[PDB]
Amino acid sequence: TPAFDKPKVELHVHLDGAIKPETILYYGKRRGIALPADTPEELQNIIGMDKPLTLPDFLAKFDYYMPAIAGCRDAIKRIAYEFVEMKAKDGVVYVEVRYSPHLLANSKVEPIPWNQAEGDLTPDEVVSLVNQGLQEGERDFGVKVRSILCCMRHQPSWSSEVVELCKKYREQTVVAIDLAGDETIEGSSLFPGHVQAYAEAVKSGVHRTVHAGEVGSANVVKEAVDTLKTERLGHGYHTLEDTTLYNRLRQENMHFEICPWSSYLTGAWKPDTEHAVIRFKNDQVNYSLNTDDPLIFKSTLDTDYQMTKKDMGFTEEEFKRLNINAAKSSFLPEDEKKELLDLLYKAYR
Ligand SMILES: NC(=O)c1cn([C@@H](CO)CCc2cccc3ccccc23)cn1
C-alpha cells in the first residue's frame, strides 16, 4: 500500500481545503448553520468531488462549509491544530500551509465573506489564532510547520494588508505571501493592489509564491515571474505552452508546486493527455508533490504519490529526489533549511 513510506515535505496545501468533516459538523451544529447533510460520511460525499465542475459549482462548496468555521475564534485555532495532526499521519516532517485570513473573519473586512453577519473576529486576529493552533500542533505532533497568507485575485484591496500581516507575524509562523482565487480573471496578476503588495514583499524580505498556469495561460505564469517576482509557482503546468519561458525557468531552477490528483479532479489536466509532471520528471525539473485541498479532493498525500507511482511509473529515487528539492525550495531560514535537508538525506539512506 503506502507508495512512499519515508518522510515528506509539502509546500502547497490550503488550510480551508483541509478541514475534517466532523469538525465542520461540530460547529455547524453548535452555531446553527446547517449544511447539506449531517453525517461525516454524507457531508464528505457532498463536499468531495469525483468529477470536474464549473467555477461556481466549485466555490459553492466553500459557501456551505466555511460559515461553520469563519468568525469563530475557537474554530479557527482548532482547524489549524487538527491540520497539523493530519499531516503527521501522512508522514510529513515539514509543511507550509496557506490560507486567506480575510476569508475567516467577520469584521474589519469588506465585503464580509460567505454571507456572514458582522461580528468581531478581525483578519489580524485570524492570523494570531492560526499561528497558535499551528505552533501547538507542531509542539504536540512533531511536524515542523510554517504558514503563507494568500491575497485573493478578485480582491486587490486586501493585498496590502496581507503583506503587512506577513511582516507583523514573520517567522512566527508566517514565511511568505501567495496569490490565489480565480487566475482567469483578465488582467488580475497586474491589478495595482497585487503588484504593490508583492513589491512590498520584495522590499521587506517576505518570500513569494503565486498560483499560475493551473487553468491560466503561460502568460499568467510569465506575469507571476517577471512582474510579481515570484520565487515558486503554484502548479505552473501551462508553462509548457511557452517553450523559451519553460527553458528559462529550468535554467533558473524555478520550483513548481505540483498537485497531481487536484489537477485531475479539477479538470486542469485532461486525463487523455501526458500529465505535465511526467515531463517535469523527464526533464529533471525542481518540483514538489502536494495535496492542494484533501477535503474537497477526498485525498491524503499518499493519494498523489499512488497516482504518480501507479499511473506514471514513478520510482523511489524520483520521490527522494523531489522531496529534497522541496526542502531546498522551502521558505525557511538558511540554517533551518540545511537542518531539514540533513534530516531527510539521513532518512533516505
Ligand atoms: N484550490 C483552490 O483554488 C483554493 C483556494 N482556497 C481559498 C484560500 O486558501 C480561497 C477560496 C476562494 C474564495 C473566493 C474565490 C475563489 C475563486 C477561485 C478559487 C478559490 C476561491 C482554497 N482552495
Ligand SMILES: [Zn+2]
Ligand atoms: Zn492551491
